[PDB]
């Protein structure tokens, strides 16, 4: 083939991922084979084709797409570590706040770009945020969820995490607005600051109830229309809202204000990526070099 395996990077949502070298250019890449349940779906065709052109410095670059033997191989730029591993590596000391702020600022730039082209991620999580040794962070697998769907289990039966999923998806609404990615990024922001996942649910109802226990059980006052969501139940227990001061210490008041806006229940109220970039939390943002 055009690409020689270097080693297995891991299992992805849709198939195995290898670090590979392009024979002709000598470039090293992450090669994702997409295994689906007849030919590639025309939905997958339309979506993947848009992704080759959706280029930004905070989006992992899709270098090429090979479609052969009725299967897709997506060839991505290679980055050496993900945020999940970097957070685990930093658990004793935590990621320094100026670096958290830089990462959040760059991720919001990537989101602002994709959202302005009407593309969303829908499955943001620390595993698909990739970092280099210079200070950049990039969104991986952008757009793959609309192209292929989000499965309950991966092809190797691993459970797809619910910890970053927005409440409107958990309540069964099948319209995903760009707000779903702001929610996930807010959860990741809180996790970087506190060194603990914010809502580590292990089932859809456990995920919802963890959200409710922190933010209050939603009602029509805070989220007009919530009681019309397909999976809303009037019998959900009523929990009161906790103050964010207890949820993300030692984050400052600007950071807590930004977080609360990214975690509004109503997707119509939730801050957009563009507005979030103008928030005073980023007034003193810098681009540090990480240790790793
Ligand atoms: C999943 C569809 C959706 O966008 N919905 C569902 C209900 N909803 C809403 O306002 O419904 C009426 C009260 C107008 C019937 C709502 C509200 C906020 C966000 C998303 C939705």
Query: For residue 155, what are its two tokens?
Result: 């092809």
How far apart, in whole angstroms, are the C-alpha atoms of residue 281 and residue 101?
8
What is the helix (H) or strand (E) element at residue 138, kind and residue range?
strand 137-139
Judge whether 47 is annotated as a binding position.
no
Is 123 one of the annotated active-site residues of the chain?
yes
Tokens of 166: 């927005």
- Residue ranges matching CATH 3.30.200.20 in the chain: 1-80
Spell out the residues 6+ positions from residue 161 whose beta carbon is closer than 8 angstroms to its own. Answer: 125, 127
> Where is the chain broken, named by the residue before each break, C–N > 2.5 Å?
37
* Rounded (5°) CA angle 16-29-152: 30
User: Residue 148 is inside which H or E element, if any?
Assistant: helix 144-148
CA of 229 to the centre of ligand 1 (A): 7
Pocket mutation for ligand 1, best pick of 167, 228, 231, 269 (most atoms within 8 Å of C-beta): 228
Q: Is the dihedral of CA 35, 110, 123, 135 positive or negative?
A: positive
Method for structure elucidation: X-ray
CATH 1.10.510.10 in the chain, residues?
A: 81-291
State the resolution, in angstroms: 1.8
Give the number of other Cβ atoms within 10 Å of residue 95's Cβ: 22
What's the length of the chain?
292
Are residues 136 and 57 in contact, defined by beta-carbon separation less than 8 angstroms?
yes
State the angle between helix axes of 179-194 and 97-116 in degrees (0 to 180), rounded to the nearest 10: 170
Instruction: For residue 51, report the distance from its CA to the centre of ligand 1, in Å.
Output: 29
Q: Are 236 and 212 in contact (CB under 8 A)?
A: yes
Question: Is 12 one of the annotated binding-site residues?
Answer: yes
The fold of 81-291 is Transferase(Phosphotransferase); domain 1 (1.10.510)
Q: Measure 235 CA to ligand 1 centroid, in angstroms.
A: 19
Among 168, 183, 230, 269, residue to substitute to test ligand 1 (most atoms within 8 Å of Cβ): 168
Query: Taking the chain, what is the end-to-end CA distance rounded to the nearest angstrom?
Result: 33
For residue 68, what is the enclosing H or E element?
strand 62-68
CATH T-level topology, domain 1-80: Phosphorylase Kinase; domain 1 (3.30.200)
């Amino acid at each position: 083939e055009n690409f020689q395996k270097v080693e297995k990077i891991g299992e992805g949502t849709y198939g195995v991922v290898y670090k590979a070298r392009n024979k002709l250019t000598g470039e090293v890449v992450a090669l994702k084979k997409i295994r689906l349940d007849e030919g590639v779906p025309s939905t997958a065709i339309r979506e993947i084709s848009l992704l080759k052109e959706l280029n930004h410095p905070n989006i992992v670059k899709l270098l090429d797409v090979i479609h052969t033997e009725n299967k897709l191989y997506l060839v991505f730029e290679f980055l050496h570590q993900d945020l999940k591993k970097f957070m685990d590596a930093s658990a004793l000391t935590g990621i320094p706040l100026p670096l958290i702020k830089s990462y959040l600022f760059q991720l919001l730039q990537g989101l602002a770009f994709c959202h302005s082209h009407r593309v969303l991620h829908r499955d943001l999580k620390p595993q698909n945020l990739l970092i280099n040794t210079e200070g950049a962070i990039k969104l991986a697998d952008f757009g793959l969820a609309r192209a292929f769907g989000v499965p309950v289990r991966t092809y190797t039966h691993e459970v797809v995490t619910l910890w970053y999923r927005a409440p409107e998806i958990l309540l069964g609404c099948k319209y995903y607005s760009t707000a779903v990615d702001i929610w996930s990024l807010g959860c990741i922001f809180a996790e970087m600051v506190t060194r603990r996942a914010l809502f580590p649910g292990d089932s859809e109802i456990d995920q919802l109830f963890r959200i409710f226990r922190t933010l209050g059980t939603p009602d029509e006052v805070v989220w007009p229309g919530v009681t019309s969501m397909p999976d809303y139940k009037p019998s959900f227990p009523k929990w009161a809202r906790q103050d964010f001061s207890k949820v993300v210490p030692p984050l400052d008041e600007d950071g807590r204000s930004l977080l609360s806006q990214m975690l509004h229940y109503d997707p119509n109220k939730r801050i957009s990526a563009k507005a979030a970039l103008a928030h005073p939390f980023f007034q003193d943002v810098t681009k540090p070099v990480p240790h790793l």
